[PDB]
Amino acid sequence: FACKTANGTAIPIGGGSANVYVNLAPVVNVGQNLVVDLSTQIFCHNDYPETITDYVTLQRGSAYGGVLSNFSGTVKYSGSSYPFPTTSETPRVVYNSRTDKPWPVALYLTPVSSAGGVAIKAGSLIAVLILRQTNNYNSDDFQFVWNIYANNDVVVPT
Numbered sequence: 674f675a676c677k678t679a680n681g682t683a684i685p686i687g688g689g690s691a692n693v694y695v696n697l698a699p700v701v702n703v704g705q706n707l708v709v710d711l712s713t714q715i716f717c718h719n720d721y722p723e724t725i726t727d728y729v730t731l732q733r734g735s736a737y738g739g740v741l742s743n744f745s746g747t748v749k750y751s752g753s754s755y756p757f758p759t760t761s762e763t764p765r766v767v768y769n770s771r772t773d774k775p776w777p778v779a780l781y782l783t784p785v786s787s788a789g790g791v792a793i794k795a796g797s798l799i800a801v802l803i804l805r806q807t808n809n810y811n812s813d814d815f816q817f818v819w820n821i822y823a824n825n826d827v828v829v830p831t
């Protein structure tokens with residue numbers, strides 16, 4: 674089991690960490706969602722599907738900078754919605770193929786009432802998402818740490 678970003682940055686067998694640079698809607702109104710779709714950014718595969726079933730969860734998701742201060746979040750994992758920052762590990766997503774499959778993570782961020790102006794700064798850390806991988810074969814328990822950075826400023830109109 675290993676993962677890669679849309680740009681080619683890979684995390685090999687055993688896990689580790691990588692940076693994900695995301696373009697964000699430049700203008701988000703109060704009452705609207707800022708959608709951060711990581712399913713188009715992070716792709717994973719099973720290296721031995723003939724024998725092994727890989728189990729994948731979002732172990733935890735943390736918010737930073739402008740996202741923590743200015744937004745109310747929800748994380749959608751494989752069609753199910755949960756609070757973001759996270760309060761529990763999600764159910765497992767099965768990886769049973771050698772073909773790259775998107776990691777089904779999407780953040781839904783709505784501005785808080787106090788938000789106004791530059792709510793997210795360009796180049797800032799916005800989230801850290803922990804992909805946890807296990808299997809039905811051995812004691813392997815690996816963490817694929819995804820550091821999410823904003824490519825641009827996000828303005829919340831006043």
Ligand SMILES: CCCCCCCO[C@H]1O[C@H](CO)[C@@H](O)[C@H](O)[C@@H]1F
Nearest residue numbers: 674686687719720721725727808813
């Ligand atoms: C003849 C025995 C061959 C042993 C195959 C081990 C390959 O391990 C890697 O890929 C696995 C499948 O994706 C992961 O379950 C595992 O945790 C690790 F990432």
